[PDB]
PDB file of C-alpha atoms and ligand atoms in Angstrom:
ATOM      1  CA  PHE A   1      46.211  30.774 -35.302  1.00 54.82           C
ATOM      2  CA  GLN A   2      49.382  32.841 -35.974  1.00 54.16           C
ATOM      3  CA  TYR A   3      50.500  32.635 -32.324  1.00 52.95           C
ATOM      4  CA  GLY A   4      49.948  28.851 -32.361  1.00 47.92           C
ATOM      5  CA  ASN A   5      46.759  29.745 -30.511  1.00 51.70           C
ATOM      6  CA  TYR A   6      44.459  26.788 -31.116  1.00 49.74           C
ATOM      7  CA  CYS A   7      43.271  24.296 -28.468  1.00 52.57           C
ATOM      8  CA  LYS A   8      46.133  21.807 -27.860  1.00 54.82           C
ATOM      9  CA  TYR A   9      45.662  18.520 -25.926  1.00 54.98           C
ATOM     10  CA  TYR A  10      48.601  15.930 -25.651  1.00 53.19           C
ATOM     11  CA  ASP A  11      50.154  14.779 -20.068  1.00 50.19           C
ATOM     12  CA  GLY A  12      53.414  12.957 -20.944  1.00 50.96           C
ATOM     13  CA  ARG A  13      55.455  16.060 -19.953  1.00 49.39           C
ATOM     14  CA  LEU A  14      54.805  15.332 -16.200  1.00 45.12           C
ATOM     15  CA  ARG A  15      57.087  12.244 -16.584  1.00 48.70           C
ATOM     16  CA  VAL A  16      59.990  14.590 -17.640  1.00 48.51           C
ATOM     17  CA  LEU A  17      59.191  17.455 -15.174  1.00 43.80           C
ATOM     18  CA  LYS A  18      60.303  16.909 -11.549  1.00 45.94           C
ATOM     19  CA  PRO A  19      57.767  17.569  -8.691  1.00 45.61           C
ATOM     20  CA  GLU A  20      60.529  19.098  -6.434  1.00 42.93           C
ATOM     21  CA  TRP A  21      60.858  22.018  -8.928  1.00 40.50           C
ATOM     22  CA  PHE A  22      57.189  23.020  -8.190  1.00 41.39           C
ATOM     23  CA  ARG A  23      56.181  21.954  -4.558  1.00 40.62           C
ATOM     24  CA  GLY A  24      55.674  25.095  -2.446  1.00 42.41           C
ATOM     25  CA  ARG A  25      57.116  27.354  -5.219  1.00 39.72           C
ATOM     26  CA  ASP A  26      55.583  30.267  -7.261  1.00 37.70           C
ATOM     27  CA  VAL A  27      55.179  29.226 -10.915  1.00 37.69           C
ATOM     28  CA  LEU A  28      54.409  31.262 -14.104  1.00 40.35           C
ATOM     29  CA  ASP A  29      53.284  29.161 -17.159  1.00 41.14           C
ATOM     30  CA  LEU A  30      53.962  31.214 -20.352  1.00 41.02           C
ATOM     31  CA  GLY A  31      51.591  30.450 -23.256  1.00 36.28           C
ATOM     32  CA  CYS A  32      49.526  28.105 -21.022  1.00 33.34           C
ATOM     33  CA  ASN A  33      47.009  27.450 -23.864  1.00 34.51           C
ATOM     34  CA  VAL A  34      43.877  25.599 -22.432  1.00 31.45           C
ATOM     35  CA  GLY A  35      45.981  25.135 -19.267  1.00 33.65           C
ATOM     36  CA  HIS A  36      45.959  21.300 -18.968  1.00 37.26           C
ATOM     37  CA  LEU A  37      49.600  21.391 -17.712  1.00 38.02           C
ATOM     38  CA  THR A  38      48.916  24.456 -15.497  1.00 38.78           C
ATOM     39  CA  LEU A  39      46.084  22.520 -13.788  1.00 39.03           C
ATOM     40  CA  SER A  40      47.984  19.219 -13.630  1.00 38.64           C
ATOM     41  CA  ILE A  41      50.995  20.830 -11.893  1.00 38.06           C
ATOM     42  CA  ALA A  42      48.796  23.050  -9.658  1.00 34.88           C
ATOM     43  CA  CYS A  43      46.769  20.010  -8.562  1.00 35.05           C
ATOM     44  CA  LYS A  44      49.278  17.102  -8.404  1.00 31.86           C
ATOM     45  CA  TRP A  45      52.431  18.928  -7.209  1.00 31.55           C
ATOM     46  CA  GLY A  46      51.192  21.664  -4.859  1.00 32.26           C
ATOM     47  CA  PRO A  47      52.876  24.942  -5.992  1.00 30.34           C
ATOM     48  CA  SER A  48      52.261  27.826  -3.554  1.00 30.02           C
ATOM     49  CA  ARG A  49      51.068  30.027  -6.527  1.00 30.91           C
ATOM     50  CA  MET A  50      50.501  29.037 -10.162  1.00 29.30           C
ATOM     51  CA  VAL A  51      49.697  31.602 -12.912  1.00 33.25           C
ATOM     52  CA  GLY A  52      48.829  30.618 -16.439  1.00 33.74           C
ATOM     53  CA  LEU A  53      49.363  33.360 -19.079  1.00 33.40           C
ATOM     54  CA  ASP A  54      48.267  33.364 -22.764  1.00 33.95           C
ATOM     55  CA  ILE A  55      47.764  36.073 -25.448  1.00 33.11           C
ATOM     56  CA  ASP A  56      44.406  34.476 -26.555  1.00 31.12           C
ATOM     57  CA  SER A  57      41.411  35.056 -24.241  1.00 28.15           C
ATOM     58  CA  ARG A  58      39.402  32.220 -25.875  1.00 29.74           C
ATOM     59  CA  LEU A  59      42.051  29.742 -24.508  1.00 28.13           C
ATOM     60  CA  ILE A  60      41.922  31.459 -21.028  1.00 31.24           C
ATOM     61  CA  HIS A  61      38.075  31.138 -20.942  1.00 34.13           C
ATOM     62  CA  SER A  62      38.381  27.419 -21.760  1.00 33.68           C
ATOM     63  CA  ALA A  63      41.207  27.076 -19.152  1.00 35.06           C
ATOM     64  CA  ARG A  64      38.962  28.610 -16.434  1.00 39.31           C
ATOM     65  CA  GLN A  65      36.051  26.296 -17.406  1.00 43.02           C
ATOM     66  CA  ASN A  66      38.424  23.300 -17.189  1.00 42.55           C
ATOM     67  CA  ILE A  67      38.957  23.856 -13.398  1.00 44.07           C
ATOM     68  CA  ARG A  68      35.605  21.956 -12.760  1.00 42.34           C
ATOM     69  CA  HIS A  69      36.998  18.786 -14.550  1.00 42.59           C
ATOM     70  CA  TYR A  70      39.943  18.709 -12.121  1.00 39.80           C
ATOM     71  CA  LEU A  71      37.554  18.799  -9.102  1.00 40.41           C
ATOM     72  CA  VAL A  72      41.002  20.695  -0.358  1.00 41.16           C
ATOM     73  CA  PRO A  73      41.410  24.420   0.600  1.00 40.69           C
ATOM     74  CA  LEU A  74      39.832  25.444   3.925  1.00 39.88           C
ATOM     75  CA  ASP A  75      38.027  28.453   2.328  1.00 39.28           C
ATOM     76  CA  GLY A  76      38.813  31.500   0.119  1.00 37.25           C
ATOM     77  CA  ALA A  77      41.430  32.763   2.655  1.00 40.79           C
ATOM     78  CA  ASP A  78      43.374  29.512   1.980  1.00 42.04           C
ATOM     79  CA  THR A  79      45.114  29.896  -1.411  1.00 42.34           C
ATOM     80  CA  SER A  80      47.761  27.235  -0.729  1.00 43.37           C
ATOM     81  CA  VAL A  81      45.881  24.196  -2.164  1.00 48.41           C
ATOM     82  CA  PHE A  82      44.215  23.523  -5.549  1.00 49.00           C
ATOM     83  CA  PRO A  83      41.959  25.089  -6.931  1.00 49.64           C
ATOM     84  CA  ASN A  84      42.781  28.220  -4.835  1.00 50.72           C
ATOM     85  CA  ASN A  85      46.487  28.309  -5.886  1.00 50.98           C
ATOM     86  CA  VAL A  86      45.820  28.758  -9.660  1.00 52.74           C
ATOM     87  CA  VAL A  87      44.679  31.806 -11.816  1.00 50.67           C
ATOM     88  CA  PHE A  88      44.663  32.474 -15.585  1.00 51.99           C
ATOM     89  CA  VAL A  89      45.510  35.828 -17.230  1.00 50.16           C
ATOM     90  CA  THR A  90      45.210  37.076 -20.828  1.00 51.82           C
ATOM     91  CA  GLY A  91      48.223  39.007 -22.027  1.00 50.88           C
ATOM     92  CA  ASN A  92      51.191  39.394 -24.296  1.00 51.30           C
ATOM     93  CA  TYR A  93      54.368  38.615 -22.293  1.00 53.42           C
ATOM     94  CA  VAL A  94      56.408  40.462 -24.959  1.00 53.89           C
ATOM     95  CA  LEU A  95      56.915  44.097 -23.883  1.00 55.53           C
ATOM     96  CA  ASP A  96      57.422  46.772 -26.648  1.00 57.98           C
ATOM     97  CA  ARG A  97      60.693  48.407 -25.424  1.00 54.42           C
ATOM     98  CA  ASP A  98      63.864  47.440 -23.455  1.00 56.85           C
ATOM     99  CA  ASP A  99      63.151  50.148 -20.777  1.00 60.84           C
ATOM    100  CA  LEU A 100      59.823  48.379 -20.003  1.00 63.34           C
ATOM    101  CA  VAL A 101      61.615  44.979 -19.631  1.00 60.22           C
ATOM    102  CA  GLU A 102      64.022  46.658 -17.122  1.00 57.64           C
ATOM    103  CA  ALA A 103      61.028  47.792 -14.982  1.00 60.33           C
ATOM    104  CA  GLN A 104      60.149  44.086 -14.228  1.00 64.95           C
ATOM    105  CA  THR A 105      60.809  43.129 -10.581  1.00 65.53           C
ATOM    106  CA  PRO A 106      61.014  39.463  -9.337  1.00 65.52           C
ATOM    107  CA  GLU A 107      57.843  37.460  -8.487  1.00 65.67           C
ATOM    108  CA  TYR A 108      58.409  33.791  -9.528  1.00 65.18           C
ATOM    109  CA  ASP A 109      60.575  30.797  -8.566  1.00 63.00           C
ATOM    110  CA  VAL A 110      59.778  28.865 -11.814  1.00 63.44           C
ATOM    111  CA  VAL A 111      58.867  30.103 -15.309  1.00 60.95           C
ATOM    112  CA  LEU A 112      57.663  27.453 -17.813  1.00 60.26           C
ATOM    113  CA  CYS A 113      58.347  28.467 -21.455  1.00 64.03           C
ATOM    114  CA  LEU A 114      57.326  25.318 -23.357  1.00 63.62           C
ATOM    115  CA  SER A 115      56.806  25.351 -27.189  1.00 63.82           C
ATOM    116  CA  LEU A 116      56.528  29.183 -27.126  1.00 66.45           C
ATOM    117  CA  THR A 117      59.900  30.503 -28.507  1.00 65.40           C
ATOM    118  CA  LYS A 118      58.971  29.889 -32.205  1.00 66.89           C
ATOM    119  CA  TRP A 119      55.629  31.779 -31.999  1.00 68.18           C
ATOM    120  CA  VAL A 120      57.284  34.716 -30.201  1.00 67.68           C
ATOM    121  CA  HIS A 121      60.274  34.677 -32.631  1.00 70.59           C
ATOM    122  CA  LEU A 122      58.113  34.684 -35.804  1.00 70.41           C
ATOM    123  CA  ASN A 123      55.569  37.292 -34.593  1.00 68.73           C
ATOM    124  CA  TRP A 124      57.987  39.707 -32.779  1.00 70.49           C
ATOM    125  CA  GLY A 125      61.476  38.786 -34.204  1.00 70.67           C
ATOM    126  CA  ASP A 126      64.880  38.421 -32.429  1.00 72.18           C
ATOM    127  CA  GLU A 127      64.220  41.769 -30.666  1.00 74.57           C
ATOM    128  CA  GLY A 128      60.931  40.497 -29.152  1.00 71.66           C
ATOM    129  CA  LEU A 129      62.345  37.082 -28.148  1.00 72.95           C
ATOM    130  CA  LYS A 130      65.400  38.744 -26.486  1.00 74.64           C
ATOM    131  CA  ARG A 131      62.904  40.891 -24.548  1.00 77.06           C
ATOM    132  CA  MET A 132      60.888  37.804 -23.497  1.00 75.87           C
ATOM    133  CA  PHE A 133      64.091  35.991 -22.325  1.00 75.30           C
ATOM    134  CA  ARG A 134      65.326  39.127 -20.423  1.00 75.34           C
ATOM    135  CA  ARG A 135      61.863  39.583 -18.871  1.00 79.53           C
ATOM    136  CA  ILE A 136      61.825  35.893 -17.666  1.00 77.61           C
ATOM    137  CA  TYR A 137      65.262  36.490 -16.015  1.00 80.39           C
ATOM    138  CA  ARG A 138      64.082  39.753 -14.326  1.00 82.37           C
ATOM    139  CA  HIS A 139      60.740  38.097 -13.221  1.00 81.95           C
ATOM    140  CA  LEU A 140      62.588  35.272 -11.444  1.00 79.22           C
ATOM    141  CA  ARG A 141      63.783  35.564  -7.890  1.00 78.61           C
ATOM    142  CA  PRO A 142      67.452  34.718  -7.039  1.00 77.54           C
ATOM    143  CA  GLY A 143      67.639  30.920  -7.094  1.00 76.67           C
ATOM    144  CA  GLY A 144      64.890  30.780  -9.745  1.00 77.15           C
ATOM    145  CA  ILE A 145      64.602  28.404 -12.727  1.00 77.92           C
ATOM    146  CA  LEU A 146      63.407  28.717 -16.334  1.00 75.02           C
ATOM    147  CA  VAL A 147      62.091  25.482 -17.914  1.00 70.99           C
ATOM    148  CA  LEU A 148      62.648  25.886 -21.692  1.00 74.26           C
ATOM    149  CA  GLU A 149      61.351  23.533 -24.446  1.00 71.37           C
ATOM    150  CA  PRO A 150      62.330  25.376 -27.709  1.00 68.82           C
ATOM    151  CA  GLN A 151      61.269  24.458 -31.288  1.00 70.22           C
ATOM    152  CA  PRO A 152      64.155  23.672 -33.704  1.00 70.50           C
ATOM    153  CA  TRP A 153      64.894  26.068 -36.663  1.00 69.14           C
ATOM    154  CA  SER A 154      63.509  23.256 -38.946  1.00 69.84           C
ATOM    155  CA  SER A 155      59.975  23.948 -37.488  1.00 69.49           C
ATOM    156  CA  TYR A 156      60.086  27.689 -38.496  1.00 68.19           C
ATOM    157  CA  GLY A 157      59.998  27.183 -42.310  1.00 67.24           C
ATOM    158  CA  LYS A 158      56.586  25.429 -42.364  1.00 66.16           C
ATOM    159  CA  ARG A 159      53.874  28.149 -42.524  1.00 67.28           C
ATOM    160  CA  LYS A 160      56.377  31.131 -42.806  1.00 67.96           C
ATOM    161  CA  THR A 161      53.641  32.552 -45.119  1.00 69.27           C
ATOM    162  CA  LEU A 162      50.984  32.916 -42.340  1.00 69.81           C
ATOM    163  CA  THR A 163      51.439  36.723 -42.081  1.00 67.44           C
ATOM    164  CA  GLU A 164      53.573  39.334 -43.915  1.00 66.12           C
ATOM    165  CA  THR A 165      55.133  40.102 -40.464  1.00 65.35           C
ATOM    166  CA  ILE A 166      55.954  36.364 -39.897  1.00 67.87           C
ATOM    167  CA  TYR A 167      57.562  36.209 -43.393  1.00 71.02           C
ATOM    168  CA  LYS A 168      59.670  39.401 -42.884  1.00 71.00           C
ATOM    169  CA  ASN A 169      60.827  38.008 -39.482  1.00 71.03           C
ATOM    170  CA  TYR A 170      61.668  34.473 -40.746  1.00 73.30           C
ATOM    171  CA  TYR A 171      64.248  36.063 -43.109  1.00 69.19           C
ATOM    172  CA  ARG A 172      65.496  38.673 -40.543  1.00 67.60           C
ATOM    173  CA  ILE A 173      66.251  36.229 -37.599  1.00 68.86           C
ATOM    174  CA  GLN A 174      69.967  35.826 -36.596  1.00 71.39           C
ATOM    175  CA  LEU A 175      69.579  34.378 -33.031  1.00 72.04           C
ATOM    176  CA  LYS A 176      68.877  30.733 -33.961  1.00 70.81           C
ATOM    177  CA  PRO A 177      67.430  28.026 -31.569  1.00 73.51           C
ATOM    178  CA  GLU A 178      70.874  26.301 -31.457  1.00 74.86           C
ATOM    179  CA  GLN A 179      72.333  29.583 -29.992  1.00 76.71           C
ATOM    180  CA  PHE A 180      69.590  30.074 -27.296  1.00 78.80           C
ATOM    181  CA  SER A 181      71.612  28.396 -24.501  1.00 77.67           C
ATOM    182  CA  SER A 182      74.653  30.685 -25.059  1.00 77.07           C
ATOM    183  CA  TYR A 183      72.433  33.825 -25.280  1.00 78.69           C
ATOM    184  CA  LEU A 184      70.481  33.023 -22.084  1.00 75.27           C
ATOM    185  CA  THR A 185      73.758  32.495 -20.129  1.00 73.26           C
ATOM    186  CA  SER A 186      75.305  35.729 -21.622  1.00 74.79           C
ATOM    187  CA  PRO A 187      75.365  39.125 -19.717  1.00 74.60           C
ATOM    188  CA  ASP A 188      72.496  40.275 -22.035  1.00 70.83           C
ATOM    189  CA  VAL A 189      70.088  37.916 -20.125  1.00 71.13           C
ATOM    190  CA  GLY A 190      72.094  36.769 -17.044  1.00 70.17           C
ATOM    191  CA  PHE A 191      71.432  33.018 -16.326  1.00 68.60           C
ATOM    192  CA  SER A 192      74.318  31.503 -14.264  1.00 69.24           C
ATOM    193  CA  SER A 193      74.064  27.926 -15.664  1.00 73.28           C
ATOM    194  CA  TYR A 194      71.952  25.517 -17.763  1.00 74.98           C
ATOM    195  CA  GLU A 195      71.246  21.758 -18.088  1.00 73.67           C
ATOM    196  CA  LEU A 196      69.435  19.293 -20.368  1.00 70.49           C
ATOM    197  CA  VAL A 197      66.555  17.252 -18.850  1.00 67.88           C
ATOM    198  CA  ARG A 198      61.566  18.221 -28.295  1.00 67.92           C
ATOM    199  CA  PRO A 199      64.465  18.633 -25.775  1.00 69.22           C
ATOM    200  CA  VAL A 200      63.833  20.321 -22.392  1.00 69.69           C
ATOM    201  CA  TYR A 201      66.365  22.582 -20.599  1.00 71.30           C
ATOM    202  CA  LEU A 202      66.692  24.177 -17.142  1.00 67.92           C
ATOM    203  CA  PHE A 203      68.261  27.677 -16.833  1.00 68.56           C
ATOM    204  CA  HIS A 204      69.413  28.736 -13.348  1.00 66.97           C
ATOM    205  CA  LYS A 205      69.378  32.221 -11.723  1.00 67.67           C
ATOM    206  CA  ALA A 206      72.156  32.729  -9.063  1.00 66.25           C
ATOM    207  CA  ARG A 207      71.142  32.740  -5.347  1.00 63.74           C
TER     208      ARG A 207
HETATM  209  N1  SAH B 301      53.560  36.694 -26.677  1.00 62.45           N
HETATM  210  C1  SAH B 301      52.770  35.765 -26.138  1.00 62.45           C
HETATM  211  N2  SAH B 301      52.327  35.946 -24.868  1.00 62.45           N
HETATM  212  C2  SAH B 301      51.528  35.020 -24.322  1.00 62.45           C
HETATM  213  N3  SAH B 301      51.078  33.881 -24.863  1.00 62.45           N
HETATM  214  C3  SAH B 301      51.542  33.719 -26.118  1.00 62.45           C
HETATM  215  C4  SAH B 301      52.361  34.595 -26.816  1.00 62.45           C
HETATM  216  N4  SAH B 301      52.587  34.133 -28.103  1.00 62.45           N
HETATM  217  C5  SAH B 301      51.922  33.005 -28.152  1.00 62.45           C
HETATM  218  N5  SAH B 301      51.275  32.687 -26.985  1.00 62.45           N
HETATM  219  C6  SAH B 301      50.490  31.480 -26.720  1.00 62.45           C
HETATM  220  O1  SAH B 301      51.393  30.417 -26.483  1.00 62.45           O
HETATM  221  C7  SAH B 301      50.851  29.178 -26.993  1.00 62.45           C
HETATM  222  C8  SAH B 301      51.832  28.534 -27.950  1.00 62.45           C
HETATM  223  S1  SAH B 301      51.398  26.780 -28.052  1.00 62.45           S
HETATM  224  C9  SAH B 301      52.303  26.066 -26.649  1.00 62.45           C
HETATM  225  C10 SAH B 301      51.235  25.633 -25.662  1.00 62.45           C
HETATM  226  C11 SAH B 301      51.837  25.085 -24.323  1.00 62.45           C
HETATM  227  N6  SAH B 301      52.825  25.930 -23.618  1.00 62.45           N
HETATM  228  C12 SAH B 301      52.454  23.678 -24.543  1.00 62.45           C
HETATM  229  O2  SAH B 301      53.638  23.409 -24.487  1.00 62.45           O
HETATM  230  O3  SAH B 301      51.522  22.810 -24.791  1.00 62.45           O
HETATM  231  C13 SAH B 301      49.488  29.512 -27.604  1.00 62.45           C
HETATM  232  O4  SAH B 301      48.433  29.137 -26.716  1.00 62.45           O
HETATM  233  C14 SAH B 301      49.587  31.021 -27.872  1.00 62.45           C
HETATM  234  O5  SAH B 301      48.344  31.716 -27.926  1.00 62.45           O
END
């Protein structure tokens, strides 16, 4: 469970997230896990498109089986209403090179990156996390928002001995959680502004 990839059930987060951010918008949920939040938002708040992405296919299978527990669209040609507005995909959001990140064209209005930063940081280092952040920016359409819930540096130490890669990265990291807001709003990423809503932040892409 080196990617934090075990089945996590909590959702209290819907009290902090605002429905207006999601209604009629295209949403990408990074590290969706078993997709309880993906399904709750997709159902309760009507996004036009909701995609849940996770590296672990066992979580994606479970997420797809969970659709039945949440159960109206007119038929298959109507993808505007739950359950026809949600899909799950297995994949690593972290691209290998910077030239690959630059090939990403916009597709979403909202990107949810909740409790993911630590797992990405430990497994793929500063380089990998910078690439995830830059990809989120490039994937968002002008006017888009990134919902970020990062883990504090204090959380990194515990289980730094999971992998040899995780250990080498824990001692090589220079971009610390406390510096994430400044990095995301820098020319390296591009976000125009940020705000505070673990703590939850909103990063804005210029219209
Ligand atoms: N590079 C990556 N790409 C996609 N998913 C990733 C990833 N690294 C880790 N993950 C997934 O992200 C999750 C971290 S746990 C956070 C779960 C959820 N977003 C929440 O807030 O409850 C795990 O399910 C893990 O498998």
